[PDB]
Design a binder for this molecule. Structure first.
Ligand SMILES: *[C@@H]1O[C@H](CO)[C@@H](O)[C@H](O)[C@H]1NC(C)=O
Length: 115
């Protein structure tokens, strides 16, 4: 597209993004955004909704008051942002930012489809 392209252009990293960069889901179903954490760097990650600049989570803790969001540790190097019930209003760009020395940013586009 170009919505998705402009979102991926916000990626700032030395290493190629090893997690999915495009997530399509059907509305009212769970979505899962994965972020790969450099294991020789400050392991702190925050999720950011680009549309309104909302800081959703900033590590193991949630900042948004929409209870459909949760952050979890899937593996030693992979964090998951769980969107419990995706709506058409949830489609758009999301940023995983790592407080490593180089300020690594990864970009994930969520597209929710409503039948
Ligand atoms: C993140 O959550 C896990 C549980 O999955 C916990 O074991 C770990 O200590 C937490 N880490 C931080 C940095 O808060």
């Amino acid at each position: 597209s170009e919505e998705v392209m402009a979102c991926l252009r916000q990626e700032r990293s030395r290493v190629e993004n090893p997690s999915q960069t495009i997530v399509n889901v059907v509305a009212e179903n769970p979505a899962y955004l994965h972020c790969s954490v450099p294991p020789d760097a400050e392991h702190e990650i925050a999720w950011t909704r680009v549309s309104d600049g909302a800081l959703l989570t900033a590590g193991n803790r949630t900042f948004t008051r929409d209870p459909r969001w949760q952050v979890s540790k899937k593996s030693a190097n992979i964090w998951v942002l769980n969107l419990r019930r995706a709506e058409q209003q949830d489609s758009g760009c999301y940023l995983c930012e790592i407080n490593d020395k180089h300020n690594t940013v990864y970009a994930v586009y969520l597209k929710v489809l409503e039948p």
